[PDB]
Design a protein around this ligand. Structure first.
Ligand SMILES: Nc1ncnc2c1ncn2[C@@H]1O[C@H](COP(=O)(O)OP(=O)(O)O)[C@@H](O)[C@H]1O
Ligand SMILES: COc1cc(N2CC[C@@]3(O)C(=O)c4cc(C)c(C)cc4N=C23)ccn1
Ligand code: VO4
Ligand SMILES: [Cl-]
Ligand SMILES: [Mg+2]
Length: 713
C-alpha cells in the first residue's frame, strides 16, 4: 500500500502511478474523477474478475493484459466468460486437456472453453433445461474457433463412433462453401449458424442439426480489394487433378471475371492441400465421388456464368452475345440447351396480364440476370450440402431428451462500403447484445422480485430498444426493413427514393444520421452498439426482391442432370419478370424464440488488434469492446446481486455433510432444513437471501461451500 492508483494513459490505455491539492491530485511514474483504485498484487491474473475488490475499467484491462501475454486467453467475468484472440496456435486444446476438464466445476479448474461446455452440459442434466452457448464479438474475434472447440469437447465427453467422426467434419465442409477471406478475417464466416447437439435421457450424443441463416451469396460474383470469394473456388482451381480438371472445364485464376482480384493467398493454408481435406471431409459425411463431382460442376458453372460477355449494339437497345463459349460451358455443366438459354436470357417471355410476350433485354439487364442466376445457383448448392450434412448427423432413431445449442453468427463489421448484407449482419449482433443485456440485468433482477427477496432495481444504462425499433419495428412508425419492403412494391421506385423516404420517416430518430449533401441520397448512417456505420443503399431494392429469369429457372428445373434438377426443384417462391428482409425477420424471430426456451451461457470474444498479429493488445480497441459488450456492468450485477441460485432440496442434499447434526431425523420442510443448516454453518446474513423456492448466494460463496464439501472424505 504505497498510494498506487491507475492514471489514464495514451500509449497503453492505463498506467499505474503513486498530494491532494483541492479538486486535483499529483501522480509520478490529473483530475479527481480521472483516477481509479488499483487492486493489491494478490489479484494478479485472477481467474474471475468478480473477486476483484476494486471493479473499474483499468483493473479489468490490466488483468486481461497480464493473462494474455502469459498464454492465458480465457478469463471469467462473473457468470459469463471473456476470451482474447491469441492469433497463435497455443497447446491448450489437446485430448489430455479434454480429459482434465471432464466433469470438473468452474472453480476446480482454470478458465477455459472446455469448462464452459462442461458446466452447461451438467446444468442440462441436473436442471433438465436446454442449454445454449452464445459467442459474441466483432469479425475475427474467435467465435467460430470457440464454437468448434465446444463440439470437439462434447463429442469426446458425451459418447459411449461414426457420429463423432461426421460431427467433427461438419464445420470443415460448411467453411469450404460458406467462409471467405475478408479484410477483417481470413476465414470469415459469411453465414450464421446454430448447431443443435441432441442428447438422450442418460446424456450421450445421439444426433445433431445445423440451422444456417442468410448466405452472403453476392460474394460469389464480386469481391472488394484484398478479399477472396468462397474458399471452395480456390480449393477446386488449385487442387483438382488432371482428369477432374477436364470434367469441370477449369482454367487459371486470371481467367474468371467473378474472381475480381485473381489469386489472393491465405498465409495459414495452401488451397491445393485444403481441397484434399475438403474431399476427405465430404467422403466421411457420406458424399460419394459422383456427388462430389456434381457439387464441383455447379461451383464451376457459377464461375463460367461470370465469363458470359454481352455487347450493347448500336442502332438498337437489344443486347447481343457474340462469343457463346462461356454459355456453352454453362449449359454443358448445368445440363440445359444452349439455344434455349441464349433466347431466354436475351429475349424472355413475360406475363403481361393472362398471356406472355417476348420482351427485349439491354446489356445491363442481361448482365444483371446472369449475375442473379449465379448467386441463386450457389445459394441452392449451399442449401443442398447443408440438407445432406443434417441428414447424416440427425440419422439416429434414439429418443432425444435435451439439447445444447451453440450460436455462431457473422460478427460486427465496418468495410469501406457497407451494403444490405452488412446491415443485417450488424443488426443480428445488436439483437445478440440486447439478449445479453436482457439476460444479465432485466431477467436477473426480475428473478429477485419473483422470489420475494429485498432488492432495489439498479438501472445499468444498457438498452438498445431505439436501434431495434429503428430497424425491426413493422408499424407505428415503420422501421428501415419495413420501409424497404414498402418501396419495393412501388412501380417507379429507385434506391435514391428509398433513402429519401428513410430521411423523412426516421430522420429525427436518435440512432439514424441523414447523409451530408455531398452524397446524393446514396448513403445513410446507423448508430449501432459497437459504432456508427455508413450504409450505401445501392442495389437494395433488387437485393430485397431477388428477381430471377423464370425462363432460365424453368430450363434448370427440367435439366437433364439430376443433381441440377434437384437444386432447382422448388421454383414456386421465385419472384421475377417474400422479400429477403421478410425472410431475415422470420429467421431472426425463430432463433430468438428458440433461445428464450434455453439457459444461455455468453462467451465474449475480444479481438486484440486489427492487424491479425500475436503478442499485440491495442488497449483502446479492447476498452471500446468491453464498453459496447457491457463487460464491466455484467461483472457489477454479479458483485452487487446474487448470481448463484439453488433450490432447498439440492442445498440440503449437497451440503448436509457440512452440518450433519443440524437437521433432526424424519420429515422436515426444505426451507426450514436449510435455515437450520445455515445457523449451524454460521454464515454472514449479507452473503445469502432465502426466497420462496430457492436460496440466493453472493459470488464465490457457493464455490467455497463446494471446496469445503471436498474436505469431507
Ligand atoms: N482460440 C484461438 N486459438 C488460435 N487461433 C485463434 C483462436 N481464435 C481465433 N484464432 C485465429 O483468428 C482467426 C479468426 O477467428 P474466427 O473464430 O474465425 O473468428 P470469428 O469471430 O469471425 O468467427 C482464426 O481463423 C484463427 O486464425
Ligand atoms: C440481407 O441479409 C443478408 C445477411 C447475410 N448474413 C451473412 C451472415 C448471416 O447468415 C448471419 O450471421 C445471420 C444470422 C442470423 C441469426 C440471421 C437471422 C441472419 C443472418 N444474416 C447473415 C447474408 C446476406 N444477406
Ligand atoms: O469473421 V466472422 O466469422 O465473425 O464473420
Ligand atoms: Cl452467462
Ligand atoms: Mg466465424
Amino acid at each position: 500500500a504505497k498510494r498506487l492508483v491507475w492514471v489514464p494513459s495514451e500509449k497503453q490505455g492505463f498506467e499505474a502511478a503513486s498530494e491532494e491539492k483541492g479538486d486535483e491530485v499529483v501522480v509520478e511514474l490529473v483530475g479527481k474523477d480521472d483516477i481509479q483504485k488499483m487492486n493489491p498484487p494478490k489479484f494478479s491474473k485472477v481467474e474471475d474478475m468478480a473477486e476483484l475488490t476494486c471493479l473499474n475499467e483499468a483493473s479489468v484491462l490490466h488483468n486481461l493484459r497480464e493473462r494474455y501475454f502469459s498464454g492465458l486467453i480465457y478469463t471469467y467475468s462473473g457468470l459469463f466468460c471473456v476470451v482474447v484472440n491469441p492469433y497463435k496456435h497455443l497447446p491448450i486444446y489437446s485430448e489430455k486437456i479434454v480429459d482434465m476438464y471432464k466433469g470438473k466445476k468452474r472453480h476446480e479448474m482454470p478458465p477455459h472453453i472446455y469448462a464452459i461446455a462442461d458446466t452447461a452440459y451438467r446444468s442440462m442434466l441436473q436442471d433438465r433445461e436446454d442449454q445454449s452457448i452464445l459467442c459474441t464479438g466483432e469479425s475475427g474475434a474467435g467465435k467460430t474457433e470457440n464454437t468448434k472447440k465446444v463440439i470437439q469437447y462434447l463429442a469426446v465427453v458425451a459418447s459411449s463412433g461414426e457420429l463423432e467422426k461426421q460431427l467433427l467434419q461438419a464445420n470443415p465442409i460448411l467453411e469450404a462453401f460458406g467462409n471467405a477471406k475478408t479484410v477483417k478475417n481470413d476465414n470469415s464466416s459469411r453465414f450464421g449458424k446454430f448447431i443443435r447437439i441432441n442428447f438422450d435421457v442418460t446424456g450421450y450424443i445421439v444426433g445433431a442439426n445445423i440451422e444456417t441463416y442468410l448466405l452472403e451469396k453476392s460474394r460469389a460474383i464480386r469481391q472488394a480489394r484484398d478479399e477472396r470469394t468462397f474458399h471452395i473456388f480456390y480449393y477446386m482451381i488449385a487442387g483438382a487433378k488432371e482428369k477432374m480438371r477436364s470434367d469441370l472445364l477449369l482454367e487459371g485464376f486470371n481467367n474468371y471475371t467473378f474472381l475480381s482480384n485473381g489469386f489472393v493467398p491465405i498465409p495459414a493454408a495452401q488451397d491445393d492441400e485444403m481441397f484434399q481435406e475438403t474431399v476427405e471431409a465430404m467422403a466421411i459425411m457420406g458424399f460419394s465421388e459422383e456427388e462430389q463431382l456434381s457439387i464441383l460442376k455447379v461451383v464451376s458453372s457459377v464461375l463460367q456464368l461470370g465469363n458470359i460477355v454481352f455487347k450493347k449494339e448500336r442502332n438498337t437497345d437489344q443486347a447481343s452475345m457474340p462469343d457463346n463459349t462461356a454459355a456453352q460451358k454453362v449449359c454443358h455443366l448445368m445440363g440445359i440447351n444452349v439455344t434455349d438459354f441464349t433466347r431466354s436470357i436475351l429475349t424472355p417471355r413475360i406475363k403481361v396480364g393472362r398471356d406472355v410476350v417476348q420482351k427485349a433485354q439491354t446489356k445491363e439487364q442481361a448482365d444483371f440476370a446472369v449475375e442473379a442466376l449465379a448467386k441463386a445457383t450457389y445459394e441452392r448448392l449451399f442449401r443442398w450440402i447443408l440438407t445432406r450434412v443434417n441428414k447424416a448427423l440427425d440419422k439416429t432413431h434414439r429418443q432425444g431428451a435435451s439439447f445444447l445449442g451453440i450460436l455462431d453468427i457473422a460478427g460486427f463489421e465496418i468495410f469501406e462500403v457497407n451494403s444490405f448484407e452488412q446491415l443485417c449482419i450488424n443488426y443480428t449482433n445488436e439483437k445478440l447484445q440486447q439478449l445479453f443485456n436482457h439476460t444479465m440485468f432485466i431477467l436477473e433482477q426480475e428473478e429477485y422480485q419473483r422470489e420475494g427477496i429485498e432488492w432495489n432495481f439498479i438501472d445499468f444504462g444498457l438498452d438498445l430498444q431505439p436501434c431495434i425499433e429503428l430497424i425491426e419495428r413493422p408499424n407505428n412508425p415503420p422501421g428501415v426493413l419495413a420501409l424497404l419492403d414498402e418501396e419495393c412494391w412501388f412501380p417507379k421506385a429507385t434506391d435514391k427514393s428509398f433513402v429519401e423516404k428513410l430521411c423523412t420517416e426516421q430522420g429525427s430518430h436518435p440512432k439514424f444520421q441523414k447523409p451530408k449533401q455531398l452524397k446524393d441520397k446514396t448513403e445513410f448512417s446507423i448508430i449501432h452498439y459497437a459504432g456508427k456505420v455508413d450504409y450505401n443503399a445501392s442495389a437494395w431494392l433488387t437485393k430485397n426482391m431477388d428477381p430471377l429469369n423464370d425462363n432460365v429457372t424453368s430450363l434448370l428445373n427440367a435439366s437433364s442432370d439430376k443433381f441440377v434438377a434437384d437444386l432447382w426443384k422448388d421454383v414456386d417462391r421465385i419472384v421475377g419478370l417474400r422479400t429477403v428482409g421478410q425472410l431475415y425477420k422470420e429467421q431472426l424471430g425463430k432463433l430468438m424464440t428458440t433461445l428464450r426456451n434455453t439457459t444461455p451461457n455468453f462467451v465474449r470474444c475480444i479481438i486484440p488488434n486489427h492487424e491479425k498479429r500475436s503478442g499485440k493488445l491495442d488497449a483502446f480497441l479492447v476498452l471500446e469492446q468491453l464498453r459496447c459488450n457491457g463487460v464491466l456492468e455484467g461483472i457489477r450485477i454479479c458483485r452487487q446481486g446474487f448470481p448463484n441460485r439453488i433450490v432447498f432440496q439440492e442445498f440440503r442434499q449437497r451440503y448436509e455433510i457440512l452440518a450433519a447434526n443440524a437437521i433432526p431425523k424424519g420429515f422436515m420442510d426444505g426451507k426450514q432444513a436449510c435455515i437450520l443448516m445455515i445457523k449451524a454453518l454460521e454464515l454472514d446474513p449479507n452473503l445469502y437471501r432465502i426466497g420462496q423456492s430457492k436460496i440466493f448466494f453472493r459470488t464465490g460463496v457457493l464455490a467455497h461451500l463446494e471446496e469445503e464439501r471436498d474436505l469431507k472424505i
